[PDB]
């Protein structure tokens, strides 16, 4: 029993050392250094296209690499592939389990993945010889609901789950090749690095982490939020990532500084973020909300600029294209909207 | 008016035609979330190593899909939000333990007050009535040291099931029922309700009991849209 007390004391003192080292490494706040810089100015955004057809609420969505097609998974048991230029539907894949919580689009455009409460991940082969889609692989093996997929490339996908782990798979092999452990609550979302070399993962313990797909091992562990982290994404340079949590709102972290730079709050905002994605230049942080809105926070300023009101139920997913031309927001009212 | 785009628009209409006859199946079934205690979960009388379990049963040519969550970790404040559109939540309580009954009361209270479940009515199955009958009649374990209020509770105006019910067993039986009903009526806004039932371990007349309460739930939902109620 005394050894447990000794280990607890060691952990407490090492945490004190960590927090003191992070202290005094910060000279000026991002607000102070970004004081002369001019505001973005109130931005007005309007729905250019409203995609209809999903029956129940939408839990996830993902833009394609061409910034033209996107997949969206809804809990009616279907995920369908749109053409956001013409609102036409390219595919409509029926799922085996209706409780899908995430989806992803393969960079090559050949594959689409999905997963949900049921602890599994399914890879769908789009470009097929027969012309009819079919499940190419089921990546079974971990407990707990699966809450985010993100194809590294063809034949390699990374998954986050509610068993407080993350895994790296081998699609053709079908076996976990690496597993990332250390989170204590459910892992809600992860974002691959722009160079597809690391990734971040916020969890239901109000703490984020950074990994490396080469050898499974946590590099940094950023704290600061007060409740469940709901979404996370990389800043375009790959040297930052903004995570929006249920605590109040959103935050920005820098890997190399290893400390929160600055937050994004306001008194009226009283619910929690549901999904986050940066803009192309990392100058417009976008964020979903339980109040059915999607605020548009300028990254460098602590004051929001625009609002994307238009959804009837809560907003669950949003993502900016690779060319930055458009922004899509699915929501629990079962509609997608393409703002520009 | 393009030429190559004709094939795409033709394709988007085959999909719409297929989605159209899936809309009328998705709306013709009722989705029930089967929650409750770890034990007393009986999705067998109602008749690949993980995830979620689904059993489909049909009553009066109405289709029900009931999802028994399994193989999930302990914390459930986050995947519970997936079931905000189910027609009803079935909550099964193991009475006749007196020990984890309070831990089942608190569990039902959290369900009632959740922000994403405020409109979903729960069907309450006070399960294991047979064990309750034996427990009070034996008298070895007495329900006073877990709920002091049982020293003053008097049986209400109700319907004892059969002539032969001991007044004691029909008193404790209804006392537990009222504990859940205090929690249910606290959120006074009548946007959802709780339907109590005294189930047993095995009861044939148990699939229909779910049917009638969903029938009541739907009717009560339609009458609200017409401001008739």
């Amino acid at each position, epitope marked *: 029993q005394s050894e447990l007390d000794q280990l*607890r004391q060691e952990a407490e003192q090492l*945490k004190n050392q960590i927090r003191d080292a992070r202290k005094a490494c910060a000279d000026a706040t991002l607000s102070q250094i970004t004081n002369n810089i001019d505001p973005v100015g109130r931005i007005q955004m309007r729905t250019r296209r409203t995609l209809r057809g999903h029956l129940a609420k939408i839990y996830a969505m993902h833009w394609g690499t061409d910034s033209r097609l996107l997949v969206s998974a809804s809990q009616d048991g279907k995920l369908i592939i749109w053409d956001s230029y013409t609102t036409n539907k390219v595919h409509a894949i029926p799922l085996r389990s209706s409780w899908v919580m995430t989806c992803a689009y393969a960079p090559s455009g050949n594959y689409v993945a999905c997963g949900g409460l049921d602890n599994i991940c399914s890879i769908y082969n789009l470009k097929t010889r027969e012309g009819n889609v079919r499940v190419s692989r089921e990546l079974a093996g971990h407990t707990g609901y699966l809450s985010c997929c993100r194809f590294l490339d063809d034949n390699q996908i990374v998954t986050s789950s509610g068993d*407080t782990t993350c895994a790296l798979w081998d699609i053709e092999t079908g076996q976990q090749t690496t597993t990332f452990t250390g989170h*204590t*609550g459910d892992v809600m979302s992860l974002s691959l690095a722009p160079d597809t070399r690391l990734f971040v993962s916020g969890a*239901c*313990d*109000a*703490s984020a982490k950074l990994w490396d797909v080469r050898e499974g091992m946590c590099r940094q562990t950023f*704290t*600061g939020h*007060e*409740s*469940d982290i709901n979404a996370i994404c990389f800043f375009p340079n790959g040297n930052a990532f903004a995570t929006g949590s*249920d*605590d*109040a709102t959103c935050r920005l972290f820098d890997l190399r500084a290893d400390q929160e730079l600055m937050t994004y709050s306001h008194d009226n905002i*009283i619910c*929690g973020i549901t999904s986050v994605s940066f803009s192309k230049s990392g100058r417009l942080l976008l964020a979903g909300y339980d109040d059915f809105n999607c605020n548009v926070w300028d990254a460098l300023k602590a004051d929001r600029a625009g609002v994307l009101a238009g959804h009837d139920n809560r907003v669950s997913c949003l993502g900016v294209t690779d060319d930055g031309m458009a922004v899509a927001t699915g929501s629990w009212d079962s509609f997608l909207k393409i703002w520009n | 008016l393009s030429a190559e785009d004709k094939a795409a628009v033709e394709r988007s209409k085959m999909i719409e035609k297929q989605l159209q006859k899936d809309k009328q199946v998705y709306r013709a079934t009722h989705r029930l979330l089967l929650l409750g205690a770890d034990n007393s979960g009986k999705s067998t009388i109602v008749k690949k190593t993980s995830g979620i379990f689904e059993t489909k049963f049909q009553v009066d040519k109405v289709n029900f899909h009931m999802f028994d969550v399994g193989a999930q*970790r*302990d*914390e*459930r*404040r986050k995947w519970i939000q997936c079931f905000n559109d189910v027609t009803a939540i079935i909550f099964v309580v193991d009475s006749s333990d007196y020990n984890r009954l*309070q*831990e089942a009361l*608190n569990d039902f*209270k*959290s369900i009632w*007050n*959740n*922000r994403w479940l405020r409109t979903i009515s729960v069907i309450l199955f006070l399960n294991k009535q047979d064990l309750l009958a034996e427990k009070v009649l034996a008298g070895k374990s007495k329900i006073e*040291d*877990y*709920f*002091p*209020e049982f020293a003053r509770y008097t049986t209400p105006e109700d319907a004892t099931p059969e002539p032969g019910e001991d007044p004691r067993v029909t008193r404790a039986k209804y006392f537990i029922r009222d504990e859940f009903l205090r929690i249910s009526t606290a959120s006074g806004d009548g946007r959802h309700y709780c339907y109590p039932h005294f189930t047993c371990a095995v009861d044939t007349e148990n699939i229909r009991r779910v049917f009638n309460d969903c029938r009541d739930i739907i009717q009560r939902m339609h009458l609200r849209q017409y401001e008739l109620l």
Partner: nanobody
Framework: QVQLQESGGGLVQPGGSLRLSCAAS????????MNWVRQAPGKGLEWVSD????????SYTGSVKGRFTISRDNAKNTLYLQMNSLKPEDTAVYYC?????????????????????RGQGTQVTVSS
């Protein structure tokens, strides 16, 4: 990072008294519900008492009803559980708890594996 430090446990004769003070830091205070959960040896951990944001919706487990008193000091960032008449059945680790969300009236916090916003624990032992 959030913290929940509790203190007050010790050896007490039956019918004695104790005070359990919960020191919190690293997260908004008033905005949340707070709970008391104890873990008696040889079985699982159970919920005891709760108090809302303002501090006006007290509620107890029947076992300790009419015996224990809770109080929230928002200014002090503290929570208390006054203990009046001990029994040898309350001998247990105590765990100051927090709700996972703010401005909300529900809490799934009894969990037996890894709930994060929960105190580290103090042992109260009642014997002779």
């Amino acid at each position: 990072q959030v913290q929940l430090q509790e203190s007050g446990g010790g050896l007490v004769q039956p019918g004695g008294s104790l005070r359990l003070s919960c020191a919190a830091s690293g997260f908004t205070f008033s905005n949340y519900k707070m709970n008391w959960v104890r873990q008696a040896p040889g079985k699982g951990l159970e919920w005891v008492s709760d108090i809302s944001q303002s501090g006006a919706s007290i509620s107890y487990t029947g076992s300790v009803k009419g015996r224990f008193t809770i109080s929230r000091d928002n200014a002090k960032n503290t929570l208390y559980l006054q203990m009046n008449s001990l029994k040898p059945e309350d001998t247990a680790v105590y765990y100051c708890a927090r709700c996972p969300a703010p401005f909300t009236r529900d809490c799934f916090d009894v969990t037996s594996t890894t709930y994060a916003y929960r105190g580290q624990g103090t042992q109260v032992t009642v014997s002779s």
